[PDB]
Design a protein around this ligand. Structure first.
Ligand SMILES: CO[C@@H]1O[C@H](CO)[C@@H](O)[C@H](O[C@@H]2O[C@H](CO)[C@H](O)[C@H](O)[C@H]2O)[C@H]1NC(C)=O
Ligand SMILES: CO[C@@H]1O[C@H](CO)[C@@H](O)[C@H](O[C@@H]2O[C@H](CO)[C@H](O)[C@H](O)[C@H]2O)[C@H]1NC(C)=O
Lengths: 133, 133
């Protein structure tokens, strides 16, 4: 398991910036955002070749320990053995994950928490930098 | 309570860089590094106006819940209402802390852990970014 950060107190409109290294043999990695490990308003899971999925981004939520219904994206701007930066924010309606190159994914805000207090990295993704705005 | 990060897995020679804003009315802030809250190889506590101390950097360790022998540094390159960056690394003998002014102190490594897995910030220090090398 990778880096875990709590007491983030990231409120709506504020931007959470993460830069990390994607392993050369990356099969998938995970960014979890929410209140804690049982309450995630964003489970961001790019799958290069995992659980039957190939180059597919799987997002989901976790509410009181229970997974919600997962949502999948066709575009997959991630590359094994490379540096990836994501900027993440949210409002009452959506969480937004922006890449530098202009890619933008949205996932519906299902938990409607006041803030993001929890971030966890997992899988083949070595976090090098975290910033708050 | 402020930012808490775990699973840092910071090995000797690797650099932990923390940037934050020191509040205009700051009385002190704290950077704790170690295995967990009961096991700290570095308790980094700049005191502007705290515990009877003024503009004094207080360092200590915590081993199995017990404070070690306290050490203080005369120099104090921190100013209320300003941005401060601290770079921290360690070896078998010492932790090394690099200051904004380019000042550098050594603090004895008393816990001699394999890595720094735990960091906690507290007090009048709003962390803006954390980086790993
Ligand atoms: C009903 O089993 C579930 O099927 C979906 C579709 O393949 C699968 O993605 C899901 O795998 C789990 O999905 C969550 C996100 O919704 C997590 O990413 C988790 O890491 C992953 O294991 C699967 N549920 C399982 C295997 O428990
Ligand atoms: C017995 O009082 C102790 O003396 C020094 C001042 O004489 C003071 O540093 C210390 O305060 C505590 O110091 C540790 C690190 O050494 C922590 O910073 C702790 O946060 C702080 O309260 C004080 N010892 C106490 C109050 O137990």
């Amino acid at each position: 398991c990778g880096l875990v950060a709590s007491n983030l107190n990231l409120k709506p409109g504020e931007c959470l910036r993460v830069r990390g290294e994607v392993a050369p043999d990356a099969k998938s990695f995970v960014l979890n955002l929410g209140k804690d490990s049982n309450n995630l308003c964003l489970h961001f899971n790019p799958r290069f070749n995992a659980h039957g999925d190939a180059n597919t981004i799987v997002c989901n939520s976790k509410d009181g320990g229970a997974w919600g219904t997962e949502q999948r994206e066709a575009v997959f701007p991630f590359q094994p053995g490379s540096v990836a930066e994501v900027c993440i924010t949210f409002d009452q309606a959506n969480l937004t994950v922006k890449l530098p190159d202009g890619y933008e994914f949205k996932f519906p805000n299902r938990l409607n928490l006041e803030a993001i207090n929890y971030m966890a990295a997992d899988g083949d993704f070595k976090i090098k930098c975290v910033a708050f705005d």
